[PDB]
Design an enzyme around this catalytic site. Sequence first.
Site: not given
Ligand SMILES: Nc1ncnc2c1ncn2[C@@H]1O[C@H](COP(=O)(O)OP(=O)(O)O)[C@@H](O)[C@H]1O
Lengths: 527, 527, 529
Positions: A88-89, A55, A389
């Site tokens: 958060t990130t 996270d 989450d």
């Molecule tokens: N399986 C996937 N296919 C396409 N895009 C993804 C997938 N998993 C995550 N993402 C993209 O990665 C980004 C980061 O997601 P995540 O790190 O889980 O949470 P956060 O958006 O809070 O950083 C998201 O904006 C999402 O659109």
Amino acid sequence: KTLNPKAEVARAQAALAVNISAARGLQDVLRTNLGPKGTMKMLVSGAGDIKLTKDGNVLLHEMQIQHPTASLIAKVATAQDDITGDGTTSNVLIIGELLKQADLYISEGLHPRIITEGFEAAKEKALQFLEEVKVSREMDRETLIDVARTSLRTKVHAELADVLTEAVVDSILAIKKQDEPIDLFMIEIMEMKHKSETDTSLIRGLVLDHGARHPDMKKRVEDAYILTCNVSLEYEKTEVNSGFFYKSAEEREKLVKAERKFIEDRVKKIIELKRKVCGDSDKGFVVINQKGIDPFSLDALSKEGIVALRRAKRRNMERLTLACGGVALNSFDDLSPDCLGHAGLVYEYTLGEEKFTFIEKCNNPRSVTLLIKGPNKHTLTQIKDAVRDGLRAVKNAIDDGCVVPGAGAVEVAMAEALIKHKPSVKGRAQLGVQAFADALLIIPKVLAQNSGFDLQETLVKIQAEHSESGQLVGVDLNTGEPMVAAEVGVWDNYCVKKQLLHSCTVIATNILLVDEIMRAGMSSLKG
Amino acid sequence: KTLNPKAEVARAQAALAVNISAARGLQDVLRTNLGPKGTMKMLVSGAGDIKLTKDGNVLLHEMQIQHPTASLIAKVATAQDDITGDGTTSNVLIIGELLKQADLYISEGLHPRIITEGFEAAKEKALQFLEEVKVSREMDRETLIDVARTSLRTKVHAELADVLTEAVVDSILAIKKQDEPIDLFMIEIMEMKHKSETDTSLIRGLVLDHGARHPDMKKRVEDAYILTCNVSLEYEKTEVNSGFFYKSAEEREKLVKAERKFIEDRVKKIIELKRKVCGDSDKGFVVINQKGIDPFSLDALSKEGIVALRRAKRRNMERLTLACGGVALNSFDDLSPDCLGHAGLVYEYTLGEEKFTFIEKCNNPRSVTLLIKGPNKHTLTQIKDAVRDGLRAVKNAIDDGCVVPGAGAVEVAMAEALIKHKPSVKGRAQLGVQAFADALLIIPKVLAQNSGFDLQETLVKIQAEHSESGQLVGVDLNTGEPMVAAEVGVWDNYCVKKQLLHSCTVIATNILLVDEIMRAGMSSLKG
Amino acid sequence: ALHVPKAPGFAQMLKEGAKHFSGLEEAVYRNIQACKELAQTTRTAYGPNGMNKMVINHLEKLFVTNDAATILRELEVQHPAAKMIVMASHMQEQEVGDGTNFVLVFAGALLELAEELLRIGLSVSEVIEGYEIACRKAHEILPNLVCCSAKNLRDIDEVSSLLRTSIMSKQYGNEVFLAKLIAQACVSIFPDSGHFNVDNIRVCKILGSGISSSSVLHGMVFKKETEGDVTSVKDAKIAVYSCPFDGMITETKGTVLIKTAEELMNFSKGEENLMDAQVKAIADTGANVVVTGGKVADMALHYANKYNIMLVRLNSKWDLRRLCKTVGATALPRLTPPVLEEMGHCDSVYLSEVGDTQVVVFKHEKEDGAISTIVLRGSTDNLMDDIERAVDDGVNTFKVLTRDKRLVPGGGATEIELAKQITSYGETCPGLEQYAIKKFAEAFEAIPRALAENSGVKANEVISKLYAVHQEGNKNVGLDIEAEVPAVKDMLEAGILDTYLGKYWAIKLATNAAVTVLRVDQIIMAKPA
Ligand SMILES: Nc1ncnc2c1ncn2[C@@H]1O[C@H](COP(=O)(O)OP(=O)(O)O)[C@@H](O)[C@H]1O
Ligand SMILES: Nc1ncnc2c1ncn2[C@@H]1O[C@H](COP(=O)(O)OP(=O)(O)O)[C@@H](O)[C@H]1O
Ligand SMILES: Nc1ncnc2c1ncn2[C@@H]1O[C@H](COP(=O)(O)OP(=O)(O)O)[C@@H](O)[C@H]1O
Ligand SMILES: [Mg+2]
Ligand SMILES: [Mg+2]
Ligand SMILES: [Mg+2]
């Protein structure tokens, strides 16, 4: 400087450069965690505790950085985390990108007010576009499953992610009602350090952290009753200071036998109630007490075949009442048989030194309990954080009547709208709109960089495929080719993104207006 | 790093960020010395000396900065200064802008090799454009006057600038030739501490820093002859250790007269030569010696009215030989009257403890002397540096058979040529070409910032005026209107700009190909 | 708590020990405040009514003077803003020699009146241009206020009446005697066709009685003694020898070689015979006193005392040349008899003593001569140093008057008239330079205000009365001194006259220092060694 020689004060350019450097550092540090193809970080505290989490909030809180801007960013991230859920990130990434885009135009000779006005206009345009582009859905079982899978895909692998998704969906469907918002504080998260992590399942009931104390007690009951109470069964003293005065040994023995009569009445009442409810040797009786129980009362209960549990938490009084359906009474006034609960399987488990209590087989439970298993402590903490989450994401998707596709097509559409909207704005706000549009395209750049493909070419291809079409063309993480985001199964949220954009705009407005970091405090060096 | 724990080392990103920060810090400081509208600096040394200068080479050395990149930049600036002349502040500004433009595209997923390959082609195109954009003139007096005025406008005010320009032009025309190149080390720079107004003119002759020693000598001498020599006139001992062995006082007096007869013979020879040259009493005789003169010879020569000097430098003899036209003999063997010089007015000036000698009114002098006058020492040093810079600029303009207009029209033309030649380059060098074209526009931006007007609007107006009409439309520093640089009288240099561009390209290639700063040297500390 | 870092660019590479002041508040305003604090120190010691100052340097000495030049020299200032003013004062003292406190006050007033302009909005360029225009106007109007010139320069009843104003400002009370002494010393050394030298006046400090016991001497004096027994000499024929009064030897190291006994017995005899012959040949020309400049011998001194020859030994490499120029003689590097044209004719050479100090007086009975020597009498070294400084200032003023015989009305009427003319001329000047012109005109009122503050009267009423008098029609009316009531008095009828070229150079140097201080933007210093 003239009034306080021991005070450090910075001007406008120095403070702006320091803030820009801090933002760039925080953006470059928290950039390998976006997407499921990111890297895992290892944090070691001062006592020697290994923590394996992914996270952004925990990674930013456990990074050992002393800075006012970093502290503000950490506070904003914690607020976003404990208000919404996941975000958060990306918050820090967008904040750093916006600060860099603002400093790119400020260093050339511009005013922060026009940049702030352009950023506000771009935020309003993006909010309008998101409100006009959101699609309504009914949120069935498949939609929640896909949302939980997309939310948990960026935590563990594939099997554990699907297991956690199924468990969260089942728990949400079990704690689901016909109306009213989804009340939390009902799913108990219990961690056990045995077996492996692939044996994670949902238990329809409640799992306690303590079992019976008397050795001469039943361990497995096929049919028993649930009694929820919090009355005191120990030797309680009076409020006023009293004293006993006898004469011989007979009077002392009589006083000893008579001083233990208050709890004896309650014990006899409980025995009579159990005999009236059951009668034969076919059913059981479980007593759930919140306070301690004297050894005499424990022996008296074990002599008849009663399994009593002492020293319980206050949160278990509502979970048991919602699962079984009993009555959490405090006194033994109207001891009616209708104030009891129904059980199905009451068995304990020994794990070396600790003891557990599993209550399975319920009629219509409303508060389940998620069982977490892990060989290590860091893995258990990571699984618990991922489950939290996922539950937050499911709650946010259920509370809203719309769904937003994930990937990065929404950011591309917002950038295209901002590019098509800048010529319609007067003044020097066009530069601010362009900077806000270029700062919003940082999500696909990080998503494509961590995968192992190009950035500029990928962005150009995405823009070319989106301008000639009219669909939400997302960014793939397997082959790099532009694919659809709202067709495979990638989803996100609307209120979460709105709050993230609002926080980013607020942070940008607060940073672009502060240009003096004066420190005139007490050093406290006396003695 | 594992072999030497007490040794710091930077990686690829850390060293690059450090170099970029150092370049930005060095560019943000020297950005206030471009154009005549700059601000003056006051340097205070550790002893208490005040220096008021405006050159960039002195500021880059009197800034007290310990950094490898800063040291390299200062060394390159000093090399440019002592090789060509004026071209250090603009060089540092262009280097910093190029480094910033390169770092802007480096932190996006690119390799510095492509940027270097693009910068090479951009420099080649700039050189090809400068080889044809230069204007060749006849190089008359008005052109040199305008060049000197443009070079000295960014130093003092107006009247002193015009006076120094006229003096430099007159000195250059006096030391001008038709077959031999412009030779330096001929104009003596004499400083004075009085009359800081219109008194820094040109002296047609030579001014020494030492006068006569005998008080009985004449002060103001009319028509006299100049005798240049460097023979010794003191009591010179033999190479082999010898000693006298007299008997009485008569032998002692004889040995005393014997060791002085060697100088008495030369004194009598000089007296006979003076009597043969003159004869009557309407002329004089001036003797210029490089070594010391004994008091006996000074008293013997004072009886005939001879104003001889002693203890001079080596350049003074060459200057006198070039001005008067005598023969700098070493021995009194073939003492012919043809090896003498011609004078007109020789008077001794006294300024308290110091004493000077004026040798003016000559037939055909070839080595003049600039008499610098100032109130203090910092003003004198500033005027001397300005005169040196003007002389270097005039020499560079004379040695070249072409002229280049100043202002900022050349940079705009080069940027337009690079933009027109941008899509004609294959590969990924288009970004490098764009960065090189945008980095060359730092001079007009800094000029508009120092003048007191806008930057983006001024650059847009200049680009529009250059695209709508193929002319050398410069940038005005008074009203901000697009004016012609070749119409007012602003001229620069071609070889100086070529060397500046070459040094900038070399520095960019050397910096963009270095990403490792290791310090594994010996500490040299024993105890 | 939380600590802030440094600026990633120039503050990190600034290196410890050094300082940086790029802003206008921490540089220009700091220099203005430093200059104001420096001007507020030597402000009470300006006019004749100002008190003295006792400054002690690091050499454990004593300096109780009154001029601002000595105070600025014995201060050791560690500030460039005040170092510029100190250098300007030193340059003014080297050029003229009577305009340091005035320059300092003018620069301080200009900086104080330009600080408010810079604060309200007037930039440095417009202020500098207005100050230059006002300085040019003042330099153009300055030659229009003369109405006073010097007639003769060799009259004793006229030179003492001009330097009295400059002497009273430095030594209030006893000024007529000092002026008469300076006039007599300048007349006794005045040559022909101009060309007045400043090194022709020698000052001698002798601890004696009071100040009235001092007198002038037409000649030179030396604080030495007589090597021989000859004291009172009537017709003295001075024969100065630059070589030491001893037997000349060889420059190269050489010894004497003797073998037989005849040489060993006759060497000293021949040496003594040659010495006696040389002494007899030297005294045969008629010399009565021999002034040497080196080491003497016993046999030579005995032979000189046998023939009654006075021997004077002195080593200073300057007093010998001064005596040769006074008596009109040339130095001889050998022990040879001089020629008639190389003799030093004097009048009376004796050896006396005054104030328990043996001195050789070379008094001459000629009215003209060459140089002179002023003998000072007192009881304190500080008073003698102050009298010597006043004499030097009077000599410098006489030299300035000889170079330029143009006079201007002193006191404070000239500055008021210049300020009024600048204010009247700046009224018809459009643009933004009118404020700078009016501020430059207000800087001229700092001299009458300082004079009224040193005297002990109201400065505002004095300035108002002076302005009313100047507007009425009178131009040569200053401020009265010998009156406790703040009134006015004529300067032409009294005799308060000062030099014009000196004041012009002082104003020019003050304007130059002001524009040089205003041209300074940022300050970059290092660490002290
Ligand atoms: N399986 C996937 N296919 C396409 N895009 C993804 C997938 N998993 C995550 N993402 C993209 O990665 C980004 C980061 O997601 P995540 O790190 O889980 O949470 P956060 O958006 O809070 O950083 C998201 O904006 C999402 O659109
Ligand atoms: N009077 C002027 N008119 C137009 N341009 C000028 C003028 N004076 C200077 N410049 C420009 O300012 C730039 C900087 O000049 P300067 O600081 O004097 O030396 P350097 O070129 O070495 O920095 C030059 O390139 C020149 O073109
Ligand atoms: N008798 C006097 N009455 C009024 N003012 C005088 C008198 N004598 C001198 N002053 C003033 O003293 C000033 C000069 O004083 P001083 O400090 O001795 O020389 P400086 O000109 O170097 O400051 C002059 O400006 C003059 O106005
Ligand atoms: Mg996530
Ligand atoms: Mg230049
Ligand atoms: Mg004076």
